[PDB]
């Protein structure tokens with residue numbers, strides 16, 4: 001029993017964190033094989049951030065302008081190239097602690113663990129979700145740039161995020177490991193803001209199925225709904241539209257509990273209408289949206305209580 | 306910016322997790338140097354759990370009765386002894402990945418990270434607090450026994466918890482690494498329940514100081530209070546009494562924000578009486594008590610390991 005927001009063990013990623021310095025800027029890098037990946041704004045000053053010409057700033061740099069430090073050892077840089085918003089530094093030593101890895105681009109609603117680092121040194125790990133507006137509600141201070149997001153399924157680390165910036169509202173934006181930003185963000189100090197955020201509906205439903213598995217049924221009702229009628233209500237509460245793909249993905253949880261997806265949608269419709277009335281679901285007074293249907297199956301038992 | 310429940314990087318602990326099997330029982334062990342530490346109930350059957358004479362069960366066992374598996378390699382057991390409720394298995398091989406460590410007993414209110422394991426294989430990491438009633442609200446399924454709790458201080462891992470059992474309310478009980486239980490619990494199938502729990506007041510105040518640092522000030526007021534008057538109100542909402550030690554420990558957060566501890570106590574007094582009124586603090590509708598004053602400082606400063 002028990003339901004916690006759980007991050008993946010950070011060990012396979014800890015052995016990849018290095019410190020990258022270019023002149024006066026110091027952020028984190030990810031050392032995989034003989035390549036170190038870090039944000040391309042490491043080559044930028046605070047004046048350069050308003051309108052940076054990265055191709056023009058990179059052409060003026062040589063390998064020895066980048067200092068890479070893995071623990072107490074200096075790695076020699078023997079090449080440099082740019083791929084979108086990430087800088088790829090070819091180093092002379094292959095990382096002996098390189099795990100089995102993949103670079104994956106995630107979609108809004110997907111969750112991941114973040115290993116927050118400062119000066120190539122990991123300081124903490126936490127779980128979070130890619131928001132529908134493409135931002136992440138993370139915990140990042142100055143110097144955390146280059147901290148990475150990941151999932152570890154089986155013996156494979158799937159890198160899905162690299163931290164690049166903080167928006168004016170305190171939320172965070174960054175790229176996949178190929179340097180492509182999530183959302184309409186640029187690595188430029190411009191007037192950009194996060195779009196209106198919506199609740200990840202398929203994740204709230206998954207968390208309601210997890211509550212039923214842990215013996216919580218107070219929120220269930222004798223009602224059902226059409227998929228269309230549910231969406232007309234949910235969107236009035238800034239909930240993300242629920243697609244037929246979402247209903248299909250919730251299939252195994254519906255079968256395990258014996259509560260049809262549209263029957264759980266009627267419980268959510270009523271929860272939005274009435275609130276909790278002093279009650280909690282899995283120790284929470286709010287409706288949780290950072291657990292995917294796949295996370296619920298991973299953490300929760302196969303036997304319902 | 307950002308405030309997340311953050312666990313320590315689990316890497317130094319991951320390299321210590323082994324699988325311990327005795328007959329039909331399979332749980333986790335902690336391999337430090339040439340000793341493997343695991344719950345002593347690994348030597349127990351389901352009939353033995355009712356009234357187990359552990360000295361009598363252990364005298365009937367030989368070294369080869371315990372199978373220890375580190376990754377895909379079998380460790381040969383060459384000795385066995387008991388220390389309170391933990392079994393110490395002397396192995397032939399010293400762990401090459403043994404970190405700098407200490408065994409420490411924590412006090413209720415102190416927090417720690419848990420690396421949840423099944424079959425000597427880590428599957429997740431999460432942060433939690435030792436409740437005032439000595440239980441932990443964790444996330445554990447069958448096979449989790451022997452999962453350990455820890456903090457990191459520089460390069461030193463401080464082991465403070467080993468999981469033993471789940472209580473009928475879904476909460477968890479376990480021992481320090483010397484086999485001494487946290488709470489009035491015993492390692493056996495018997496009628497035991499968690500006592501009435503209280504809110505860790507010094508931790509709620511620390512989390513209110515973290516909200517002010519992140520730009521949340523709606524709960525602040527012009528009022529102050531005496532330590533005695535605050536404790537009379539706290540005693541009514543099942544909150545831990547606040548001592549002068551707690552006030553002293555909150556000193557640095559009081560200086561950083563410019564809000565005296567008794568001024569923050571007047572704000573908490575008003576949240577306990579009148580509620581939140583549709584508002585949230587750091588994205589929460591409940592008052593959070595699993596962040597110590599040190600955790601607030603470490604997360605809002607960037608302390609690396």
Ligand SMILES: O=C(Nc1cncc2c1CCCC2)[C@@H]1CNS(=O)(=O)c2ccc(Cl)cc21
Pocket residue numbers: 041049140141142143144145163164165166167186187188189190306
């Ligand atoms: O956003 C940025 N840094 C940063 C990253 N993570 C966490 C935190 C910060 C700043 C302090 C607070 C915590 C920088 C500088 N500020 S900026 O607006 O010039 C900017 C813009 C784009 C890019 Cl890609 C980068 C940046």
Ligand SMILES: [Cl-]
Pocket residue numbers: 105106107110
């Ligand atoms: Cl995805």
